[PDB]
Amino acid sequence: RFLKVKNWETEVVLTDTLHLKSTLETGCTEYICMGSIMHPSDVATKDQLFPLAKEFIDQYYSSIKRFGSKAHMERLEEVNKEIDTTSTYQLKDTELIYGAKHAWRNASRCVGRIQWSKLQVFDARDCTTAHGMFNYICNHVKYATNKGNLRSAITIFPQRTDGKHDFRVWNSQLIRYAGYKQPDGSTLGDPANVQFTEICIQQGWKPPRGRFDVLPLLLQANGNDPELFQIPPELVLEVPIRHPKFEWFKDLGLKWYGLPAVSNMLLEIGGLEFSACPFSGWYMGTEIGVRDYCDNSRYNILEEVAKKMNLDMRKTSSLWKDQALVEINIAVLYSFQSDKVTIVDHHSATESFIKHMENEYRCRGGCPADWVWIVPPMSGSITPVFHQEMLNYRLTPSFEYQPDPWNTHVWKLV
Amino acid sequence: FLKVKNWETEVVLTDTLHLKSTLETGCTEYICMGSIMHPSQHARRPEDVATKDQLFPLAKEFIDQYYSSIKRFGSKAHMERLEEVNKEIDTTSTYQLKDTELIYGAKHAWRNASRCVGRIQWSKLQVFDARDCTTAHGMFNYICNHVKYATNKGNLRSAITIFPQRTDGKHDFRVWNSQLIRYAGYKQPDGSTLGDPANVQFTEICIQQGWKPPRGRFDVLPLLLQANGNDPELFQIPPELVLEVPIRHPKFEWFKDLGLKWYGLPAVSNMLLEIGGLEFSACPFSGWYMGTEIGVRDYCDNSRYNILEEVAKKMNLDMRKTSSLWKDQALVEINIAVLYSFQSDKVTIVDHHSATESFIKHMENEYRCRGGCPADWVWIVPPMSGSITPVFHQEMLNYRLTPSFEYQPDPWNTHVWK
Ligand code: HEM
Ligand code: HEM
Ligand SMILES: C[C@H](O)[C@H](O)[C@H]1CNc2nc(N)[nH]c(=O)c2N1
Ligand SMILES: C[C@H](O)[C@H](O)[C@H]1CNc2nc(N)[nH]c(=O)c2N1
Ligand SMILES: Cc1cc(N)nc(C#CCCN(C)C)c1
Ligand SMILES: Cc1cc(N)nc(C#CCCN(C)C)c1
Ligand SMILES: [Zn+2]
Known part of the structure; x- marks a missing residue:
């Protein structure tokens, strides 16, 4: 089967076969469309993990033109051993890089995906403490900022195990400004961050109470209580x-x-869940x-x-x-x-995305895209994406929403 | 039940009306088609004259809905109405709507139009019954009266004029114009376009039919009217009616x-009004x-x-x-x-x-009294300054209720000329 999408400005028609690969739900049904719903909808068992791992390893070896190879079959057997003996498995570095890039490539709400294959991947899977996380994040910020010539990057912390030892960045982005509710009902700084600002103050952050206070990092390693760190001000451009x-x-x-630098999303690769995976662009x-x-x-x-x-x-x-x-x-x-x-x-940005989208249809057979998010929030119809029909579906690897950690963390101190 | 949230106000509405949806949206649980212009070809009855077991269920559905709306379900008049429709289909393969049913159906087609941000007005709609029309000359008369009424010297009033329903598919009434008033478009010698490029094809048909184009940038197009499946005929709207x-x-x-x-x-004139399995292929409607x-x-x-x-x-x-x-x-x-x-x-x-503020109010009214409001975010959000309007931040559910307005093929793609 094929699905056609048309651009009503240029009359170009593209043919989608990639949607046949889609996995999980959009949220819609045959009789209701939930395309404008923001969020439409403990850990995987051995039986659930096997097919997810196989699908990812198959697609990795097909991407490098080694499907069916001796190395392909040995990797499948190796992955199967690990799941059997440990209920999980570990990605090779090559597979982690491939997986992180393709989660970006597959992010249907992102208009900047023409850049997807130029992503610097920092492997932080050896990290064990919040101090180690702070160090990895400082290095990410410095590398990505690059004195203003920004470079896309992601840092990937250890994957979920039993769900009781999650790594989490409690911040929603690495760099955001505090918000303070005032007695008279007004707000100082960024109203979106009031709740997270209160958590930081409770943990002992001493706030300047200005309009643009860079928030501290609140980092959780291995399911422990999160800890506060100040990003060195010279790294914040x-x-x-x-x-x-x-x-x-x-x-x-x-x-x-x-x-x-988004830091509250979850990265899923071959059934493995990376609950801390801050990524940044421009x-x-x-x-x-x-x-x-x-x-x-x-x-x-x-x-x-x-x-x-x-x-x-x-x-x-x-x-x-x-x-x-x-x-x-x-x-x-x-x-x-x-x-x-x-x-x-x-x-x-939207012009480049149309070029990217057409290239993806030609070389990959499609490009999942969320029109509601791709069209910019001003001047919609004078950008080319407004006139572009798009198909939305979920491919994996993928970036996913996850609960805010203060809504699920069970504290340990005193 | 399904919830929709407004992310500016945190208001949450609960939708039960979607349980009454009839046609596929085009989406599946694996693919969303919400930005596709025409995502679905799911129709309620096949291409032309249905058999009895195809049309009567749709008629029964609409008559049931109408009599439910007026608190008369199962009443004497409801049951006679069903027997009456059954005999009409039996003897003519179709049936005729009562005046009250026609008005109810038109207003509800507007109320059900998920792409329309103007629907807070839906019950304020003047319905002109033109089902006695037989010729393109009569259609021109009906359309002139519609335009004059709706224009009202600038104090515009919403109206719809409804010409005879489709019978066999070879006797269609059609307004070939896409709107009652549009400007012509002309292909220039050098390759550019003068006037409205969207109407170049329709303009050429008119010229080919004997229209003499003034060849300006804002030439009001003639009407091209088709009655009872005959060849269409050109008419000039009197310019004093064109504000x-x-x-x-x-x-x-x-x-x-x-x-x-x-x-x-x-004044949209190329859509199809579907009521109880009946198809009104010419139903020009206008607002502001x-x-x-x-x-x-x-x-x-x-x-x-x-x-x-x-x-x-x-x-x-x-x-x-x-x-x-x-x-x-x-x-x-x-x-x-x-x-x-x-x-x-x-x-x-x-x-x-x-407009968008009014639509949020309309949404709240509809969830309170009806249990839902079908709405197409892609069409409701204005094409500029999206996020500084309240609808940008409003989650919406899109589903297809009947009666409805539907797209239909352009008549020059299907008409065999005489
Ligand atoms: C390189 C320059 C980039 C540009 C210009 C860009 C642009 C955007 C924009 C404008 C949005 C919508 C944001 C919003 O409205 O809140 C977005 C969303 C998103 N971006 Fe990109 N992006 C870039 C890089 C990246 C990278 C490097 C990644 C991951 C590796 C990424 C993953 C995502 C995801 C997952 C979303 C959806 C977030 C959500 O659903 O809330 N983007 N992007
Ligand atoms: C009274 C003031 C009205 C306003 C301000 C209004 C506003 C709008 C707007 C802005 C659109 C999008 C049009 C486009 O982008 O091409 C639309 C679509 C639509 N309107 Fe309304 N409208 C009004 C009245 C009506 C009436 C009286 C009817 C029918 C009786 C109606 C039925 C529709 C339909 C079916 C669509 C969808 C058309 C399509 O899918 O192409 N509207 N409206
Ligand atoms: C309700 C609606 O889905 C919501 O406001 C969306 C609309 N489109 C968006 N598009 C982008 N890029 N970012 C957003 O936060 C939103 N918000
Ligand atoms: C492809 C896309 O759906 C198409 O350009 C739509 C987008 N939203 C729209 N919204 C309105 N009101 N009118 C339109 O014509 C369109 N066009
Ligand atoms: C990498 C990146 C670049 C960019 N230009 N924008 C974003 C974003 C976003 C929204 C994240 N969402 C959780 C709110 C992300
Ligand atoms: C009655 C009405 C009022 C208005 N303000 N706008 C419209 C429209 C439209 C587009 C119809 N579609 C076939 C292109 C219709
Ligand atoms: Zn959908």
């Missing part, structure tokens, strides 16, 4: 936000960090300029910017929000570019 | 010199515009009027690199102009902020 035409913009006192401008700054639940700067622009804010049909949103996103891109910190605008 | 808005900007005095206009009445339909899609799509270049030039933006966001900046100004122009001429229009 930041960009002050100014505007090429409005001299007053710099007086808003805005800044942002250069390195987007920003698309709208992530900061539209969501971080202008979401009503975030820094929410539209009103203040529109004021300094002298816009008519009495009626929505003046489009004062739309006008202010564009200028903010102009400022974000100008600031990063002026400081020579890698960033991509949404027009360039 | 148009010249586009200007509240700050940029040069904007008027771009010479842009648009029409006030959005959301500004972004004109200012974002009609004006700024690359394969439409494609005016971003022109506007940005006049604005003296840096068009050297995408990252100056000159396209985004011009886009906003164009949409300010469109809203300001319609509002200045007292022609009904809604901005995407007010």
Whole structure:
């Protein structure tokens, strides 16, 4: 069977056969589509693990043109021995690298996948303590930041065993700003991070109580209670936000960090679960300029910017929000570019994604893609992805959501 | 039960209405087709005249639903209605809707249109019964009256005009236009396109049928009307019925010199209305515009009027690199102009902020009284400034309820001319 997707702007038609490989659920049924649901839906037994491991090893050996080889058959036997004797197995370094890259390649919500095969993989599977995790994360941050010439990277900590000894980065990204709820109901800093900021303070973090306090790392090794660490400030690259035409913009006192580094997701390779696997790339401008700054639940700067622009804010049909949103996103891109910190605008990013998508259909037979996430949060239809039909399905290896660790961790101290 | 969450407000709604869905969405538990324009060809009855065991179950379903809606399930009139429909199908292979059933069905087709952000208005719909129509001349009369009623000197009113249902498939009534009012598009000698590129094919059919094109950038197309399966016939809508808005900007005095206009009445005329297994292949319906339909899609799509270049030039933006966001900046100004122009001429229009806010309210009303609201996020979220509208942050369930509006093939792909 084949499925066709059409681009309604160019009339190009692509043919998807890769979906026949899909594994788990989208969340939809034959009679209901759940494509706009954010999250649609203890450890694997021996019997469950065998077929998952085989499927991954088969696809690895097919990727390197050695399917059926003596080395292929011996690896399968070796993996089977380990599962039989230990209820788990260990990836070779080559398989871990291949698996991490393909989880990125398979991330249907990521528009930056043209870069998927250029991913620096740091193997941290020998780590045993939160101090060791801190060291690996500092090295990742330094390598990835690269004085502003950002490089994609992932660091992979030891895989889940019985579920009682999980490695976890409690942060949602390696670098984020604190949020503080005030007595009068206002919020200082980033409202998204209020809860995690409270956990840090409880663990003994002494907060500066400013608007852009870089949060400490809260690291959990081997299922133990998590521990606090301060990222050395010289490793945290930041960009002050100014505007090429409005001299007053710099007086808003805005800044942002250069390195987007997701740390709360789970990486699944051949049935193995890597619950701590922070990965980083570089920003698309709208992530900061539209969501971080202008979401009503975030820094929410539209009103203040529109004021300094002298816009008519009495009626929505003046489009004062739309006008202010564009200028903010102009400022974000100008600031990063002026400081020579890698960033991509949404027009360039979506154009590259269409090229990537077409290449993937030709060389791989498809490209799972989540239109709801791929289309940027402003100016949707003037980007090419808006007009591109897409098919969403789940391939493995994959990145997955997982529960926040404070909702499941059972504490040990006192 | 299925829950939907709003991630801005944390409101959670519980959906039971989806249990009443009839047609496949196209998705499976392994693949999602939510961004496919036409994901499914699952229809309720086969291509042409059904047999009795194919049509009667669908009729019984709709009549049951209608009499349930008015608290008369099993009533004397309900059971007679069923026997009446059974005899009609028995003797004519079809059946006829009562006036009240037709009105209920049209309003519910709008209420069930998951892609429409305007549905808070669904019960305020004027229904023109045109099922006595027999000729293209009669269709033109009915359409002129619809347009005049719906335009209402700029205080627009939602309406639908319903022509005779399909019988055997060779006597279809069709409006060949895709909307009652659109602009012509012309292929130029050098290869470019003048006017609206979306309508180049339809324009050529009209010229081929004897229409004399003025060959401008905003030539209102004639109507091409097909009655009872006969060859279609051309008619010129009287221009005093065609309300148009010249586009200007509240700050940029040069904007008027771009010479842009648009029409006030959005009037979809190429969809199919399905009620109880009956197919109304000509059912033009109209409401009023959301500004972004004109200012974002009609004006700024690359394969439409494609005016971003022109506007940005006049604005003296840096068009050297995408990252100056000159396209985004011009886009906003164009949409300010469109809203300001319609509002200045007292022609009904809604901005995407007010429309999406109304739809969230509609969603809450529908979950409270009906147990659900089918909604297509891909279509509901406006094509600019998505995440600063509330629907961006609203999870939605999409499912197919009947009565409904459906796509149908373009008639020049199937008509054998006489
Ligand atoms: C190299 C430059 C990259 C760019 C420009 C980019 C861009 C993006 C953007 C704009 C999003 C949506 C983010 C949001 O709205 O919250 C996203 C999501 C995502 N990215 Fe990428 N990305 C890049 C690299 C990577 C890398 C290196 C990985 C992993 C190895 C990755 C994996 C993902 C995943 C799994 C998601 C979905 C997250 C979720 O579901 O919440 N990306 N990306
Ligand atoms: C009264 C004001 C209305 C507003 C503001 C409105 C708004 C919209 C918008 C913006 C779209 C997306 C159109 C596109 O992107 O091409 C749409 C789609 C749609 N509307 Fe409404 N609408 C209104 C009235 C109506 C009425 C009266 C009906 C039928 C009786 C209707 C039925 C539909 C249908 C079926 C679609 C989907 C069309 C498709 O799939 O191509 N709408 N509406
Ligand atoms: C409800 C909806 O699914 C949700 O708001 C999504 C929409 N699309 C998105 N797209 C991206 N890139 N990031 C997001 O957080 C979201 N949020
Ligand atoms: C491929 C994609 O589904 C297609 O471009 C859709 C996206 N969303 C849309 N939304 C609306 N309202 N109208 C449209 O025409 C489209 N086009
Ligand atoms: C590597 C990367 C680059 C980028 N530009 N963006 C992201 C992201 C995200 C969202 C993560 N999600 C858990 C909220 C990730
Ligand atoms: C009544 C109505 C009002 C409005 N504001 N918009 C539309 C539309 C549309 C698109 C239909 N589709 C076949 C392309 C329809
Ligand atoms: Zn779906």
